[PDB]
Design a binder for these strands. Sequence first.
RNA 1: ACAU
DNA 2: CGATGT
Length: 134
Amino acid sequence: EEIIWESLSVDVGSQGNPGIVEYKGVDTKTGEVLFEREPIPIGTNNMGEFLAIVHGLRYLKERNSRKPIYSDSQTAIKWVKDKKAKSTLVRNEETALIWKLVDEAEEWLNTHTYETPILKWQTDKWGEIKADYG
RNA sequence: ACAU
DNA sequence: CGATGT
Ligand SMILES: [K+]
Ligand SMILES: [K+]
Ligand SMILES: [Mn+2]
Ligand SMILES: [Mn+2]
């Protein structure tokens, strides 16, 4: 129904899919950029969305913030809930970096706790997520 | 089909 | 038009 304005919104950007992947997190209300990940040479859209949520969890926990996270990715939301990123991306030397990050994000989820609500951004009703790259 |  | 996902 109503946007929860006191929240963090994340989004992925890519050049190709698979391709160069980056992500960022922003204050939903103000658009202030709170974090941005250095581009990763090869990854998928869903790996990036997953990393963005987990980074959001770690960012909010470090700051003792109870804000929710918005993501528009049904896939990544599920992967975080499951603590398992079920990506189809081949493992090779060019994908080693993204896979290490994904593996390490899963490991963090399996060794930490959080109450942070992870919410679906309802693009059909509210327009583009505030962290959108465009 | 839905979400990217 | 292609690809990533549930
Ligand atoms: K995007
Ligand atoms: K499809
Ligand atoms: Mn997105
Ligand atoms: Mn986007």
